[PDB]
Amino acid sequence: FNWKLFWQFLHPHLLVLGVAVVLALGAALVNVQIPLLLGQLTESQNLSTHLLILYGVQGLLTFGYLVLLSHVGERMAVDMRRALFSSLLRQDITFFDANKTGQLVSRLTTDVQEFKSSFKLVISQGLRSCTQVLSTRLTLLLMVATPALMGVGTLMGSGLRKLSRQCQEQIARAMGVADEALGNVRTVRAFAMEQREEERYGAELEACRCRAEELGRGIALFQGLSNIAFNCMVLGTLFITGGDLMSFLVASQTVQRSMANLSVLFGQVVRGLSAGARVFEYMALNPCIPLSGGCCVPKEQLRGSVTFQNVCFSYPCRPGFEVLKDFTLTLPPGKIVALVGQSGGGKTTVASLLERFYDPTAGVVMLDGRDLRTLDPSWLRGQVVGFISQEPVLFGTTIMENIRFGKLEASDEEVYTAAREANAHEFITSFPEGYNTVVGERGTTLSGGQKQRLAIARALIKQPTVLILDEATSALDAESERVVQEALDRASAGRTVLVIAHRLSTVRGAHCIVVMADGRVWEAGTHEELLKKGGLYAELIRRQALDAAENL
């Protein structure tokens, strides 16, 4: 896994890598003749011009060998970042709840560069140092191979890998304290608890040093023992022609100086290998639910009948705490089914199961008789179901491209037709640039009602058969709430709609209402049926009628 995947990225760049080896051997080959011709120095002018040619040749051989190594290292990094980001996006929602967004961005950009630059330095110094280095040759090569093997034959006992893993654990822990403090700085200032956050970070900061000093003392232990191991190798080979033994002792002294350069970079070797291990860690991960694995149903066959049969669910984070318990509900095609209940009853959880973000622990969820497990998730989310959350998410691009997120192969004329259906075209045209206006952090800040109107137009381009509306008009102002709801009803026409609303006034004219308590269907039926039943709905609407009469 560590070296099996590493070879896959190195293999295409290996041809370019070989050219740099030749250039490095040739560069130090010119360096051998440099003091040779210097010792020899009209006779002077012929030799001085000759020496100036050799400097430019060595300087060109060194530059090229360093440029090729920088090119191989950077191109290998892009292939790793491309493969990791693709594998990260494929990962299920359970993983994104367990792992912070900040640490994932760091593993994708910092850890890759930490390995890349470390890989560059080991070959840059290694190749240069090794080029500076019949019977004496065999004994010399034997002494170079020993610290490369012995540094692994000793790594079997105490593990420098456990020290770096403990160091990376505290590095991410202190990183999360800074992200929570600086990210919610406005809330920190509000209650003027800055010195408390500095203390909370300061404590994690001294622990950050503590674990790094332990690894630091560990890396220094290897470097020190490696110096003793080499000097003992000299004494070992001395006891294991007389002119060869005499020459070898001077030759080992030259290797000792060259091996010392690699022993200095051992700290980078640890840091770099630990870095790349984390890059290949999340790259190999396979999610529970795939993205392309399934079957598609044509628009001529798809009617839009959603059926939940004895669906029991519990989140993978809390396997004990049951969210949905024996939940049975069937949505008729074209009919608008309302969903009412207490906060924490599993309302938003029901919706996420239909979008197939998670699969039930018991029972099945079916779309027109076909189970969602056998269906293609990308097809279901991207062409069948249209989701609308209580808080809309707008990317850092233009308004025209932000709506175009619904259907990839959608024309410019398709966006304006979709925007007119969600009463968005009226206020978008009013802007100076209009549809070419950027939105988000860098772009123009938009009101709650304006943002939600854009989200409706986004979900309408893909022409959905099923529509989920989870508290679409939650934190909207009285005026904006009336506008957005009016456009939502127009989009609800001729579609299967699962309305999860807080305002009971909009769910009064639905196909049927589903009251939910402790993840179970508590009450079900039409508006009149649930009033005649005298249940939870009747008590809820009784309190609603008293509040309404008081406002008149």
Ligand X SMILES: CC(C)CCC[C@@H](C)[C@H]1CC[C@H]2[C@@H]3CC=C4C[C@@H](OC(=O)CCC(=O)O)CC[C@]4(C)[C@H]3CC[C@]12C
Antiparallel, parallel or unpaired: β 385-388 and 322-331: unpaired
CB of 211 to ligand X, least distance (A): 23
88 touches 282 (CB < 8 A): yes
537 touches 531 (CB < 8 A): yes
Which amino acid appears at position 186 of this protein?
A: R
Ligand-binding annotation for 347, yes or no, is yes
Binding residues for a second copy restricted to 200-229, rule: CB under 8 A: 201-202, 205-206, 208-209, 212-213, 216-217, 219-221, 223-225, 227-228
Binding residues for ligand ADP restricted to 301-340, rule: CB under 6 A: 315, 317-318, 323
Does residue 543 touch a second copy according to CB under 8 A?
A: yes
Phi and psi for 538 in degrees, rounded to 5?
-60, -40
CB closer to a second copy, 85 vs 522: 85
Nearest CA among 381, 369, 347 for reference residue 501: 347
DSSP string for residues in 436-457: G-BBSSSSB---HHHHHHHHHH
Ligand-binding annotation for 103, yes or no, is no
Site for a second copy (CB under 8 A): which residue of 291, 296, 362, 517?
291
Binding residues for a second copy restricted to 168-197, rule: CB under 8 A: 171, 174-176, 178-197
Site for a second copy (CB under 8 A): which residue of 16, 19, 22, 41?
41
Q: Which does 400 bind (CB under 5 to 8 A by kind): Mg ion, a second copy, ligand X, none?
A: none
Site for ligand X (CB under 6 A): which residue of 151, 334, 440, 535?
151
Tokens encoding 131: 């080029």
Alpha carbons 80 and 87: distance in angstroms, whole number: 11
- The region of 29-37, 124-132, 346-354, 432-440 touching ligand ADP under the rule CB under 6 A is 346-354
Q: Is 459 exposed, middle or buried (0-12, 13-18, 19+ CB in 10 A)?
A: buried
Alpha carbons 392 and 456: distance in angstroms, whole number: 10
Alpha carbons 192 and 318: distance in angstroms, whole number: 35
CB closer to a second copy, 209 vs 310: 209
Antiparallel, parallel or unpaired: β 322-331 and 520-525: unpaired
Q: Any idea what DSSP says for residue 306? A: E
Binding residues for a second copy restricted to 463-522, rule: CB under 8 A: 471, 474-480, 482, 502-505
513 touches 341 (CB < 8 A): no
Site for ligand ADP (CB under 6 A): which residue of 49, 195, 445, 551?
445
Q: Which does 445 bind (CB under 5 to 8 A by kind): Mg ion, ligand ADP, ligand X, none?
A: ligand ADP
Length of the chain: 552
CB closer to ligand ADP, 268 vs 450: 450
β partners of residue 366: 307, 371
Q: What residues contact 55, with CB distance under 8 A and at least 6 apart?
A: none
Q: Which does 348 bind (CB under 5 to 8 A by kind): ligand X, Mg ion, a second copy, none?
A: Mg ion
CB closer to a second copy, 23 vs 337: 23
202 touches 245 (CB < 8 A): no
Does residue 344 touch ligand ADP according to CB under 6 A?
A: yes
Binding residues for Mg ion restricted to 290-349, rule: CB under 5 A: 348
Does residue 474 touch Mg ion according to CB under 5 A?
A: no
Does residue 345 touch ligand ADP according to CB under 6 A?
A: yes
Q: Which does 381 bind (CB under 5 to 8 A by kind): ligand ADP, Mg ion, a second copy, none?
A: a second copy
Ligand-binding annotation for 341, yes or no, is yes
Does residue 152 touch ligand X according to CB under 6 A?
A: yes
Binding residues for a second copy restricted to 418-437, rule: CB under 8 A: none
400 touches 458 (CB < 8 A): no
Binding residues for ligand X restricted to 219-278, rule: CB under 6 A: 226-227, 230, 256, 259-260, 262-263, 266, 269
Site for a second copy (CB under 8 A): which residue of 12, 56, 287, 494?
56
Rg from Cα positions in the chain: 34
Alpha carbon 543 to its chain's center = 47
Nearest CA among 407, 506, 419 for reference residue 464: 407
CB closer to ligand X, 119 vs 416: 119
- The region of 3-11, 17-25, 234-242, 363-371 touching a second copy under the rule CB under 8 A is 234-242
DSSP string for residues in 333-365: TT-EEEEEE-TTSSHHHHHHHHTTSS--SEEEE
CB closer to a second copy, 11 vs 542: 542
Alpha carbons 51 and 25: distance in angstroms, whole number: 19
Alpha carbons 427 and 446: distance in angstroms, whole number: 11
CB of 58 to ligand X, least distance (A): 9
Tell me the residue number closest to ligand X, measured at CB.
151
Does residue 166 touch Mg ion according to CB under 5 A?
A: no
Count of Cβ atoms closer than 10 Å to residue 86 Cβ: 10
Count of Cβ atoms closer than 10 Å to residue 445 Cβ: 9
Chain positions contacting ligand ADP, by CB under 6 A: 97, 315, 317-318, 323, 341, 343-349, 445
Query: Residues comprising the binding site for ATP?
Result: 341-348
Chain positions contacting ligand X, by CB under 6 A: 119, 122, 126, 147-148, 151-152, 155, 226-227, 230, 256, 259-260, 262-263, 266, 269
Chain positions contacting Mg ion, by CB under 5 A: 348
Query: Residues comprising the binding site?
Result: 341-348
